[PDB]
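Build the 3D complex.
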Amino acid sequence: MFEQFESKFIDCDGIRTHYIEMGEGDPLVLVHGGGAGADGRSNFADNFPIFARHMRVIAYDMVGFGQTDAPDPAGFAYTQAARTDHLISFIKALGLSKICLIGNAMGGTTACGAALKAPELIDRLVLMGAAVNISPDDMVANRYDGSEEGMRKIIAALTHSYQPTDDIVHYRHEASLRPTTTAAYKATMGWAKQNGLYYSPEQLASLTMPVLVLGGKNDVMVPVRKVIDQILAIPQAIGHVFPNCGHWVMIEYPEEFCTQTLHFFGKL
Amino acid sequence: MFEQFESKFIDCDGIRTHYIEMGEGDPLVLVHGGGAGADGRSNFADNFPIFARHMRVIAYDMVGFGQTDAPDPAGFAYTQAARTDHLISFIKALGLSKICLIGNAMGGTTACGAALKAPELIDRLVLMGAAVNISPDDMVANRYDGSEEGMRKIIAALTHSYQPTDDIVHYRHEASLRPTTTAAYKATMGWAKQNGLYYSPEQLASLTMPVLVLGGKNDVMVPVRKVIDQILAIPQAIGHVFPNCGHWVMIEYPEEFCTQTLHFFGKL
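Done.
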């Protein structure tokens, strides 16, 4: 699946990193979510050609995910900081400046970290159901199971009223079972569950570029009150709340997602 | 001022009502806010030609305001219900069906009341810094003074970073001093202050058409947490929060206001 995009690879301080790209113009980098089997292609395949009309659009696979190196977790610590440095490494590796940058969930954690840690690379940031204020306790109070049904339950949970295709289910399911990424995933989520996916309101308010904050009203992973807290904690932030929408705005409402982001990026 | 628009008049169950209009297409009705000297023209003059490219755009003066009858408050009770029935009366008087409808503040109170009371007239509703959940106590806990400065202070209060022209100031100031509307205004605000501008969460959630909810993050009259409560109380509602923006979204960010509403109305 997804062979309409040419897989490319580049080295990011010794992490070999898979990415796809499409279109021409100013660079836009998309960061996928941190669910099991997640990667760039499957997260953003529907948005890619809409965005490619206006921008040079790039989705990469985060360390531990997709077809990017998933270093052995016996010697690699799967911390937010590693994700964050990988992204910065990636953006630099392609020689990109002044990017537009969008992150879903843990990918939002990561986009946010790069924006704070390396603002000179990033002109605009979009946080979309982004885990940027989820504490260990926040994860506690919220609350995989193997198989093709288990994956179908995941998807029905992260979405409001969206029926995935069989090809999509099977791609994600197979993906969740790749053994290197399954290990990296178990580490990634273990660390997240104990340390949370979290920046302080002070750090959030320290973001230096324009920011748009997106959220589905029915999202159960990053509930809408958390999205609101981000709109309110980040002074310059625009907020847009989608109704009848779970944790995958970009998949559940792809046209509206691309319209709002492209408008915010100044391409309409 | 505002003579680029042709003043028209029509009778609304014995209330003679001023309105302007422009463009061709599906009908869009705009409802001004309830500040002193407020009317359609001064509220919406900047948005009118943008909207007129796509729709038949109509701004009217609410009972007690502008150049619409301001019946003597010794015999006329200036209740939300009167505003609400006037609007319904107006929409029917021009023979309009399936309108798009936008209300600022008390005009939002009024648009909301018409949507609840006469849903068959209204295809889409936009509530923009709308007083639809402001209780007497809410007004208490928030907290005119005559002159051209007093009006300049009003405007600097309802806006974040907006410098009105001298012509605008003088038009509003003169307007606030018209004696029939000054009386109707004192009644209007007296009733509002004691009864509030308020529908219950149950009523709010009972709205039957699509709804977009707009708010400026810095609005001091209808604070942003009230705007959020409306996004959350109205299940189908889209929410958009503007940064660096007070209580007059349509004036402070006219292009973004027209873009979001026109997109929501399906004219882009």
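Chain A has one domain: 1-268.
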